Amino acid sequence: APLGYLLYRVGAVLRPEVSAALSPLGLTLPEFVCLRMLSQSPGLSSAELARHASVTPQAMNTVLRKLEDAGAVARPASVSRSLPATLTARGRALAKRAEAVVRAADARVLARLTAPQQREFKRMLEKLGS
Amino acid sequence: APLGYLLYRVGAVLRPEVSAALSPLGLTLPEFVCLRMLSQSPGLSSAELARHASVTPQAMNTVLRKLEDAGAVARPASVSRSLPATLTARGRALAKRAEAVVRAADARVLARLTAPQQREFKRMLEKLGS
Numbered sequence A, B: 001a002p003l004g005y006l007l008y009r010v011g012a013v014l015r016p017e018v019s020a021a022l023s024p025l026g027l028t029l030p031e032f033v034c035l036r037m038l039s040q041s042p043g044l045s046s047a048e049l050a051r052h053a054s055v056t057p058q059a060m061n062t063v064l065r066k067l068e069d070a071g072a073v074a075r076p077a078s079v080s081r082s083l084p085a086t087l088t089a090r091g092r093a094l095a096k097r098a099e100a101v102v103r104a105a106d107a108r109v110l111a112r113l114t115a116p117q118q119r120e121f122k123r124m125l126e127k128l129g130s
C-alpha cells in the first residue's frame, strides 16, 4: 500500500462529496479550485490551476472562460497588456459560499475520525506538505 | 485550507521524490502506477489506470504501449479476442524492485513524523479512504 495509493483513495472519497456539495451553487470542483486559488494567488498560470484541479490545461482554460463569462473572474486590459485574472465582487461572494459548503463536505469526510484525531491528522498533513 | 488542498500539497512533495527514486530503474511514475495496479488487478481500463496516475487516457495508452514493448506487460490474443493486460515474469520482477524503491521514497517523506505518528497517520488514511 504505497503512500500515494492511500492518498489517492482518500481523494477518491473526498471528490464526489465535494462535487455534490458544490452542485447547488452551480459549480464544478475545477471551477471551485480556480476560484479559491485565484482568490489567494491572483495572476496564476492555468497550468498551475490545472495541476491543482487535476484537469488538463485546455479544460482549465474552459473553466477560466466560464468563470469570466459568469462575472466571477475578470482580466481587465490595462490602460497603462491585460491584467492577470482576479475575482470580482461577485466572484469573491461566490468563492465564500463555495468555501463554506466545501468546509462542511470536508467535515463530513473527517467525521470518520474523533475530534483529536482530526486535529492530529491535519497537523500531520501540514507537516508532510510543508 | 480545504482538506483537498492539504492532500494536494502532500502529493506535491511525494511525487518528485518517487519519480527520482524510480529514475535509475528507467521508470516514470505513470509507468510505476500501471505496473503496480496491473499486478494487483489484471484487466483494468486505461481510464482507471489514468485516473490513478493522474494522466490523460492517451498518455496512459502510451504508457501501456511502452510497458508492452519492454516485455513487462502483455496482452496475448486468446486462442479460445485478446487477453486483458497482465504482467510477464519480467514485469513482475521490475514491479518488485520498483515497489522497493517507492517504499523507501515513502519512508523518506514519512520521516517528518515520529514512528507512532506514522502508524497513526497510515491508519487515519485507511479509515478516510475505506
Ligand SMILES: Nc1ccc(C(=O)O)c(O)c1
Pocket: A002, A003, A004, A005, A008, B011, B014, B015, B018, B029, B033, B036, B052, B053, B102
Ligand atoms: N505520487 C504517487 C501517486 C500515486 C502512487 C500510486 O501507487 O498509486 C504512488 O505510489 C505515488
Ligand SMILES: Nc1ccc(C(=O)O)c(O)c1
Pocket: A011, A014, A015, A018, A029, A033, A036, A052, A053, A102, B002, B003, B004, B005, B008
Ligand atoms: N477533492 C478536492 C481536490 C482539491 C481541492 C482544492 O481546494 O485544492 C479540494 O477542495 C477538493
